[PDB]
Each structure stands twice: as C-alpha cells, then as structure tokens.
C-alpha cells in the first residue's frame, strides 16, 4: 500500500506519457501526464490544452526521469481533440485525445470496460502516477481509494453528479500537481480515470472516468484526423471564414456520406465542400470544407456541424465546432 507518494517502478509504467512543451527540455518544459493507447493516440485531460494548441506540443510516451532523454520515445503533437461539452468553469468532461505525428509501437494501456466504474465499491484501491504527486523530474505514484459518488458529490460539487455513471469520481488519499495522468484500478491495472482536479493543497481528488467516456475515445481514436475547433475568439461583425480539413488515415477508403448542415441557421452557410467534390478519401487522402458565419448580432455564436462517412469497418464521424464572440 503506497500510502505516500513515491517514485514509481518504471518497468510498471510502460504506458505512461508526459506532455512537455515543444522545443523544450523534457524536465523544464514538462506541464501534464497522459496515457499511451496505441498507434498515434495518447489520452489526457481537456485543461491541460485551455491555453496550448498541437504545434506546441510534444509527447514522451513511457517516459520515467525526465532528465534522461533516452527514456521513451518523445513524439509531435499533431492534433488535439476536446470533449465539445468540456466546460472549463466546473471541468466536466475534462477529456481530450493528443493525436500525434506519429505512431508508437511501446505498450499500450488497456483502458477500463465501459462497465467497470459503476461496478466498484468504495475503497477499491487504486493508483495514479505522475511527476506532481506531494518539482522533481521522477516519475510517482501513490495509492488512493474510490470514494462514495453521493459523498464525492457534497464535498467536492463543482457539478459532481451523485450518479456514478457520470464525468467524474473522486478517490482519497491515505494521508498532486499534474493533471491528465492515469489512475488505474490498483488489481488489474486497467485505466479508470485521468487526474482532473482537488487536492491542490479536507478534500478528495477528483477524476474524469474513463468507463463513461469509452465511446467518445473510440470515436476520437478512429483514425479519421481533423481540425476540430476553429475558436475565432472576439471578432467584428460580418461574415467570418474558415476552413476545416479531413484526413484518412485508415487503410481502407473513407465515403463521404452525410453531414448536419442543415441543421445549423441562417447564420451559418458551407462556402466550399471540398469532402463533396472528392466523396472517396484513400489512404492518407484530405478533402476540406469552408464554413462562414455571418455575425449580425452581439452575442456568443457556437456552431457544430459533423461530416459522415462509411467504410468497410461502418461508419466515421467528425465534428467540428466555429465559435467566435462580439
């Protein structure tokens, strides 16, 4: 029982990532933890990208002493993917998916069964690692134990549901400074959760579930690489422009098959689709749209808009999301 935190035995966190700012020593430039899912996927929390994007982002996918720069193998961010409902006020839905410039063939996590969580009783033990836990360039790791969800709910709040099938569980130390790290299920090692919030310091940590969230991974490790989110951020009135790519990865052929433009308002028009003119994407093939909004009023505009496609495997979707405000 690792009641306090404690430098981590290497060979048992083959998985583990750590998030380090681009062109950066891996120690100094170290910001957030993450896990390895296999191929070109790491998974990790929303906040540790409010103010980051790709291009400034690097991964060291089983990394350990961080100082040590022939541990792990650090990778290029290419393209990060939020939870479109992640409020960063409250910090639900604090997931996101780091897709990288290349695949990894290191050991992958195996990430909890969609009904694994709301299985557990409270006090099944588990334990979270990370360079934070209470900086120093060695991996940690510390035993926590699941909390009751009605309790997690009145201590911490913050929009905790009392439900346990929901966003996020708390676990309680027996006695943490880096977001976006595994906390597994201490028999068996699957991923439970990502280190979200609490215990900055009477309070529990708080962590995103990973049981709820398994087909918004699998939708977001699909091998369909996109621009998610075009935030304009504070704009003039008129018609504001962007264009959104599309990218197969995958080795058989993408079909353009359907897409929710229609259900977006007046406000919001398609300029270009490029995914119409091109309808079959092959390996490694782009198709781009080009969307506008036409802001004629003060306000918040928010647009989601999804493209499908059909393929041997069934079906693919991305969304993507314009957002600006005046």
């Known amino acids: 029982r690792i009641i306090n935190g404690s430098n981590a035995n290497s060979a048992e966190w083959p998985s583990i990532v750590a998030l380090v700012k681009r062109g950066a020593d891996a120690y100094q430039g170290q910001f957030c933890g993450g896990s390895f899912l296999g191929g070109r996927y790491v998974?990790?929390?929303?906040?540790?990208?409010?103010?980051?994007?790709?291009?400034?982002?690097d991964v060291i996918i089983g990394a350990y002493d961080l100082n040590n720069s022939s541990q792990g193998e650090r990778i290029a961010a290419q393209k990060i993917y939020r939870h479109l409902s992640y409020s960063p006020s409250n910090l639900l839905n604090d997931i996101a998916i780091v897709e990288l410039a290349q695949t990894s063939?290191?050991?992958?996590?195996?990430?909890?069964?969609?009904?694994?969580?709301?299985?557990?009783?409270?006090?099944?033990?588990?334990?979270?690692?990370?360079?934070g836990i209470t900086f120093t360039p060695i991996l940690q790791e510390v035993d926590v134990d699941l909390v009751s969800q009605s309790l997690c709910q009145i201590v911490m709040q913050h929009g905790i549901?009392?439900?346990?099938?929901?966003?996020?569980?708390?676990?309680?130390?027996?006695?943490?400074?880096?977001?976006?790290?595994?906390?597994?299920?201490?028999?068996?090692?699957?991923?439970?959760?990502?280190?979200?919030?609490?215990?900055?310091?009477?309070?529990?940590?708080?962590?995103?579930?990973?049981?709820?969230?398994?087909?918004?991974?699998?939708?977001?490790?699909?091998?369909?690489?996109?621009?998610?989110?075009?935030?304009?951020?504070?704009?003039?009135?008129?018609?504001?422009?962007?264009?959104?790519?599309?990218?197969?990865?995958?080795?058989?052929?993408?079909?353009?098959?359907?897409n929710t433009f229609s259900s977006l308002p007046a406000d919001f028009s398609v300029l270009s689709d490029g995914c119409s003119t091109k309808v079959t994407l092959a390996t490694g093939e782009s198709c781009s749209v080009e969307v506008a909004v036409d802001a004629q009023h003060y306000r918040q505009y928010q647009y989601d808009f999804e493209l499908i496609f059909s393929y041997a495997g069934g079906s693919k979707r991305a969304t993507s999301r314009i957002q600006l405000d005046t």
């Open 161 to 258: 549901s009392s439900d346990p099938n929901s966003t996020n569980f708390c676990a309680a130390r027996l006695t943490q400074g880096d977001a976006g790290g595994p906390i597994v299920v201490k028999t068996g090692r699957e991923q439970l959760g990502i280190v979200s919030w609490g215990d900055e310091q009477g309070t529990y940590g708080v962590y995103t579930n990973v049981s709820y969230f398994r087909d918004w991974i699998t939708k977001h490790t699909n091998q369909l690489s996109y621009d998610q989110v075009a935030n304009l951020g504070i704009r003039p009135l008129g018609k504001v422009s962007q264009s959104f790519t599309y990218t197969n990865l995958d080795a058989n052929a993408l079909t353009y098959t359907g």
């Open 43 to 57: 998974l990790t929390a929303a906040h540790c990208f409010d103010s980051r994007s790709a291009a400034s982002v």
């Open 105 to 131: 063939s290191l050991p992958a996590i195996t990430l909890a069964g969609p009904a694994t969580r709301t299985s557990l009783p409270a006090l099944t033990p588990l334990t979270v690692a990370g360079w």
